[PDB]
Design a protein around this nucleic acid. Structure first.
Ligand SMILES: [Mg+2]
Ligand SMILES: [Mg+2]
Ligand SMILES: [Mg+2]
Ligand SMILES: [Mg+2]
Ligand SMILES: [Mg+2]
Ligand SMILES: [Mg+2]
Ligand SMILES: [Mg+2]
Ligand SMILES: [Mg+2]
Ligand SMILES: [Mg+2]
Ligand SMILES: [Mg+2]
Ligand SMILES: [Mg+2]
Ligand SMILES: [Mg+2]
Ligand SMILES: [Mg+2]
Ligand SMILES: [Mg+2]
Ligand SMILES: [Mg+2]
Ligand SMILES: [Mg+2]
Ligand SMILES: [Mg+2]
Ligand SMILES: [Mg+2]
Ligand SMILES: [Zn+2]
Lengths: 78, 116, 136, 51, 60, 177
RNA sequence: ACUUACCAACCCGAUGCAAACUGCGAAUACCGGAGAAUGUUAUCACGGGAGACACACGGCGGGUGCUAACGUCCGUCGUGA
RNA sequence: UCUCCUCCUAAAGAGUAACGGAGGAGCACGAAGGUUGGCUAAUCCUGGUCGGACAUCAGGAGGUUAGUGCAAUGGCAUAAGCCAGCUUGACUGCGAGCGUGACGGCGCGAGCAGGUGCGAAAGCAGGUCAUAGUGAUCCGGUGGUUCUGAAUGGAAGGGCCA
RNA sequence: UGCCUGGCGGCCGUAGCGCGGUGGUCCCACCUGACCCCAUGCCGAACUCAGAAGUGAAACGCCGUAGCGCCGAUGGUAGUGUGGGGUCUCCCCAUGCGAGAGUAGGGAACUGCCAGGCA
RNA sequence: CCCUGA
RNA sequence: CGGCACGUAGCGCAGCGGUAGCGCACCGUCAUGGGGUGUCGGGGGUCGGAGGUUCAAAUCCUCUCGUGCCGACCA
């Protein structure tokens, strides 16, 4: 008896890193994700693996917006 | 449909200018008239406006739907913007090809003093 | 012997059988055999019960089978050490929760329906009752 | 695999080279590109050369 | 229309034997002499039995 | 231009009287005429496709688009992106001049002509027909042909229904049987 | 052109099932902030010294096994150690 | 079977095991990268020369059921999908801050200096829709740099950069 | 200040579809010509330019109507944290949270800035 | 190379 | 029970992203008064069954049914 299975990949540690209402510095990663599950709002940038990073100081603010009801992340300036 | 195709073309540039927070000189064009609005970074408050349907330009203009009309509208909206003291706007063509009447308006505003 | 024509996957987890059932009303016909106990119904068991019903009624009336054995069950052969891969699929079961109308019947008088459902309940491994269609 | 390494060496004689890969069978002609040479600190033409 | 890629397309005269003279732009170059047109085709104009033949061949 | 003037002066009046319309814009127009050739043996000889392109160009007075495969097909051994046809689109003045050429010259020259089918409308008012031998067009000289070819003609019309489309073509005196 | 010992796709109405289905969606858990009381700083950093890296059973959530084993492998809690 | 990627198990943050259930990788591409401009799918029905169940054409229905260089997941209409013009940012030195590992390491990154490409401009560009496509150290090979050079001047050799 | 129209937004289906009607002084759209500025891997179809004879046919906007889409209680149910219990594969009790679907119903959007026409 | 029995 | 090798015309075998071929056999005509040999010339295959990827499967992948080969050892 022998199995054709048995392989898995090491987990990439995705998810929301800093949650809503948390105060961040400039350049802090907010989420890591595969594709724009969350989109970048004000003062948030999208790096090439679609990583949303805080472009300025302030507090993280999750919201929904737009005609497709897509989830945006903003940084409200302190 | 022409209007929906044009709005689909314009959406990318408008959303980029919204992200950058720029004061927009938006131009609208019809077969008979041509319209220009300088609009605030929040996108809801129109700072200044000038168009060929106004009598103050349409009296001097021969026909309202040509490049001379576009140049007159561009000079008009530029002088109102400089009177109100903006001096720095970004052009929003709204999906019309930057050519012909839209180019004439943008050039007229650029010579008259708006910076883009 | 009921079995899906094809499935996305050949093997499934064991899972659990909690909760009470949906599809608890007599929907198409007039009488129903409803399961009160909890368990699994093998395709062989379903087939034996259906055969007993149809032979008891002598092919008048109409019989609906309201369950389908869509979950595959594996087994290991004898003299095989524990742990070398999931075993091979042997049979298919339908998980049953209480109140689940297993079989259902129309076109026959009530006493003959009760007798047929009694024979099939004798072939089934779980506790059943006889129910009648109610207006709401 | 079949893609093999090449270098793009300077036309300014500074000795500076980038290294890339190339598919020789489909694209046998030589590669030249205008890229930045940090020795002279200007963009100049890099031409293909062997490793 | 794009320039220099389209064929030469200049007006010629086509004459049909029913006395018809017509002028059309076309690419053939020379004049045209037509056997039939829309004014003399029998379909356009409108130009398009056993017991009978038995009686005709065996009248009594 | 001849049949276009004929349209403007009498066909719109005829259709107004026939259908009790309210608008001359509601009175149907002939929108375009599209000529197509399926030259699928280009896979064996691509040069014959260039011959068919020259053929269609000479017929329509216009350089044709070389149309390629939308998706690959197993039975006909064609790949996606491979050129298998040609097409011209006629609008405006050239459309009217070609339409006059067709209905006056080329249609009476058809071998064994008994009329065109009145069932050839696509349910929306648009007409389609086929030409079996391009030699019916006088632009193609006889002894310069290499292979007998055909084409098909689609008159696309802004009419809403089959009755309206066939009424428009009958008002242009299109030889229906 | 007809008949069905017959077989049936789409759609419509009614009924179920899914770890690798989701237009819905909790309880908990986790992250951040504010506030009171309580706790021998219970927290973090740095330095000296280790041991340990063979776990067991019980409850809950599961894979596997036969929803077999005082079986086996995980998560979390408790006790023994 | 041994390294790497995707889903589930995995108990709604992260992580999580078995000779648990299913699939992939050991590349490709100077355009399949950059930017500017433009465009929207699958399938079916109707009509049409060869032409047929299926080629190219026209119209309608439909609405992403398509597509993505290659698995699966998560994304995508402002398209990240498709067509064209000009191109080399597939740049050099750095980098606030952050994520992820016991460590070795790995990833994201606004912004600053020099020089460039596309754009009328705002701008965008430090490779590709993202996640696989890999290999420490030693010992050596080639190009640049006197940084060193066993009395001194060189050189060999060593260092530093590629 | 009222009505109609155009542009840019807020919010993102109570806001979208369908069906019926209606509007052209202005505005908008179709429209009329194209050797030109510019354009089609063919075509002034589209993009563009110069215009204003016609029509609101299509489109668009507005109005009305539930055939749908959509929103949606109260009560009950399922689940579940903590403590306890049973006949322990599964449930029950005390207590805290409490859906999904369905039902009564709601429902033919609301609103800001600028400009134009009429009153 | 072969030639069914009388 | 584990692998691993093949199923292709009536028979025996090659072919393992596009064509399906070879020898014997069968058939038609010659040669012989007749048969065999021999000469001229035809035709024959769901590629074991079935389904997944793909422009397209005898071929790549998987399940399944036969046959054959090699191991089911230490206690
Ligand atoms: Mg251990
Ligand atoms: Mg343990
Ligand atoms: Mg144990
Ligand atoms: Mg998790
Ligand atoms: Mg959890
Ligand atoms: Mg652990
Ligand atoms: Mg790409
Ligand atoms: Mg673009
Ligand atoms: Mg791209
Ligand atoms: Mg990729
Ligand atoms: Mg020395
Ligand atoms: Mg010395
Ligand atoms: Mg050296
Ligand atoms: Mg026009
Ligand atoms: Mg109307
Ligand atoms: Mg509810
Ligand atoms: Mg409505
Ligand atoms: Mg013998
Ligand atoms: Zn004639």
């Amino acid at each position: 008896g022998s199995t054709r299975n048995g392989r898995d990949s090491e987990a990439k540690r995705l998810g929301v890193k800093r949650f809503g209402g948390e105060s961040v510095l400039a350049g802090s990663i907010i989420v890591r994700q595969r594709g724009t599950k969350f989109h970048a709002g004000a003062n948030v940038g999208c790096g090439r693996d679609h990583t949303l990073f805080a472009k300025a100081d302030g507090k993280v603010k999750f919201e929904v917006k737009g005609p497709k009801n897509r989830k945006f992340i903003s940084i409200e300036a302190e | 449909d022409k209007k929906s195709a044009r709005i689909r073309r314009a959406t990318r540039a408008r959303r980029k200018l919204q992200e950058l927070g720029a004061t927009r000189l938006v131009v609208h064009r019809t077969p008979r008239h041509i319209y220009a609005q300088v609009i605030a970074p929040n996108g809801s408050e129109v700072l200044v406006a000038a168009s060929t349907v106004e009598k103050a330009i349409a009296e001097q203009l021969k026909y309202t739907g040509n490049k001379d009309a576009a140049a007159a509208v561009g000079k008009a909206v530029a002088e109102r913007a400089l009177e109100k003291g903006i001096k720095d706007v970004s052009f929003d063509r709204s999906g019309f090809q930057y050519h012909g009447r839209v180019q004439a308006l943008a050039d007229a505003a650029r010579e008259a003093g708006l910076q883009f | 012997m009921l079995q899906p024509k094809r499935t996305k996957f050949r093997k499934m987890h064991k899972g659990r059988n909690r909760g009470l059932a949906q599809g608890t009303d007599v929907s198409f016909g007039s009488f129903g055999l409803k399961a009160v106990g909890r368990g699994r119904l093998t395709a062989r068991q379903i087939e034996a019960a259906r055969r007993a019903m149809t032979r008891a009624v002598k092919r008048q009336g109409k019989i609906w089978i309201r369950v389908f054995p869509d979950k595959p069950i594996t087994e290991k052969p004898l003299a095989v050490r524990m742990g070398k891969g999931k075993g091979n699929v042997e049979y298919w079961v339908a998980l049953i929760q209480p109140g689940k109308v297993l079989y259902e019947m129309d076109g026959v008088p009530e006493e003959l329906a009760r007798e047929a459902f009694k024979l099939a309940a004798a072939k089934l491994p779980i506790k059943t009752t006889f129910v009648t269609k109610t207006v709401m | 695999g079949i893609r093999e390494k090449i270098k793009l060496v300077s036309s300014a004689g500074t000795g500076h080279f980038y290294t890339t890969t190339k598919n020789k069978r489909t694209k046998p002609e030589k590669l030249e590109l205008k890229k930045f040479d940090p020795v002279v600190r200007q963009h100049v033409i890099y031409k293909e050369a062997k490793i | 229309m794009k320039k220099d890629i389209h064929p030469k397309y200049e007006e010629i005269t086509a004459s049909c034997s029913c006395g018809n003279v017509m002028k059309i732009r076309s690419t053939v170059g020379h004049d045209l002499n037509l056997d039939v047109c829309s004014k003399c085709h029998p379909f356009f104009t409108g130009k398009q039995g056993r017991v009978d033949r038995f009686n005709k061949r065996f009248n009594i | 231009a001849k049949l276009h003037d004929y349209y403007k002066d009498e066909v719109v009046k005829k259709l107004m009287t026939e259908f009790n319309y309210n608008s001359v814009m509601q009175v149907p127009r002939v929108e375009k005429i599209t000529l197509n050739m399926g030259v699928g043996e280009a896979i064996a000889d691509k040069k014959l496709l260039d011959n068919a392109a020259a053929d269609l160009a000479a017929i329509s007075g216009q350089k044709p688009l070389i149309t390629k495969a939308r998706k690959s097909v197993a039975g006909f051994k064609i790949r996606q992106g491979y050129p298998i046809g040609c097409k011209v689109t006629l609008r405006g003045e050239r459309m009217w001049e070609f339409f006059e050429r067709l209905i006056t010259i080329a249609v009476p020259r058809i071998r064994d002509f008994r009329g065109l089918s009145a069932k050839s409308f696509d349910g929306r008012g648009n007409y389609s027909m086929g030409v079996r031998e391009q030699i019916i067009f006088p632009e193609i000289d006889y002894d310069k042909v290499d292979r007998v070819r055909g084409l098909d003609i689609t008159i696309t019309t802004t009419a809403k229904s089959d009755e309206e489309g066939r009424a428009l073509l009958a008002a242009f005196d299109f030889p229906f049987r």
